[PDB]
RNA sequence: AACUGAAGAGUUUGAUCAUGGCUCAGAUUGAACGCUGGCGGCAGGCCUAACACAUGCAAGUCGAGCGGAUAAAGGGAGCUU
């Protein structure tokens, strides 16, 4: 589906000769409010056209996320580049408390109780990779129990 | 009766990623200063010169321990209040 959310806008450039050609980039994540997200990056020549391009690439190559219901399954920790990310599920009344670019991922996924923090280099185009290695590699235990459930899930 | 919280941003460049400094958003004080100023509860008030101090007051009490001297009421008498 489609619920859109913008994060970043830049002004990249390019020197040719004579002057300097400008261009705009944008980063936009799209989710469904249930656990299907997708991010997208587009470059164009103006703001109202660079956002439209980044929205279209978001709703291609999406991710199914197996959330527990407004929370996560377990504390995990993933990294990409020089960016390290930590996330652990929380109680009911606590909302989402994260920084800038992990709120926009964790809104549209539908989770509400995420309690996150990012270390290392804060790059909004690169902390998103650090988040999607984490969420796309969840497990959601298909087991008979948890304190007993290590005889039917390990064979899954 | 026993008991749960973790946010980032700006700045090196024609522009980008990284390393690395700096700076801001918070909660606090025996606080001082500037502008302004109705009320009441509960608190606190020399952090500097352990530097000198006028004048008041802050440890006395026992006559069921003993001398001594003050000697009432009253008992009076006497003399004339």
From TrEMBL:
Which Gene3D superfamilies does the record match to this protein? 3.30.160.20, 3.30.230.10
Annotated GO CC locations: cytoplasm; small ribosomal subunit
Molecular function per GO = rRNA binding; structural constituent of ribosome
Which GO BP terms, alphabetically?
Answer: ribosome biogenesis; translation
| Superkingdom of the organism of origin | Bacteria
Q: Write down the InterPro entries for this protein, in alphabetical order.
A: Ribosomal_Su5_D2-typ_SF, Ribosomal_uS5, Ribosomal_uS5_bac-type, Ribosomal_uS5_C, Ribosomal_uS5_N, Ribosomal_uS5_N_CS, Ribsml_uS5_D2-typ_fold_subgr
Keyword Transport attributed: no
What keywords appear on the UniProt entry? Ribonucleoprotein, Ribosomal protein, RNA-binding, rRNA-binding
Give all residue intervals belonging to the S5 DRBM domain.
2-65
Subunit organization: Part of the 30S ribosomal subunit. Contacts proteins S4 and S8.
Q: Which HAMAP family match?
A: Ribosomal_uS5_B
Family indicated by similarity: Belongs to the universal ribosomal protein uS5 family.
**Role summary:** With S4 and S12 plays an important role in translational accuracy.
The record's annotation in PANTHER family points to:
MITOCHONDRIAL RIBOSOMAL PROTEIN S5
- Comment on protein domains: The N-terminal domain interacts with the head of the 30S subunit; the C-terminal domain interacts with the body and contacts protein S4. The interaction surface between S4 and S5 is involved in control of translational fidelity.
Protein name (Swiss-Prot/TrEMBL) = Small ribosomal subunit protein uS5
Whose protein is this, by species? Pseudomonas aeruginosa
The gene name reads rpsE
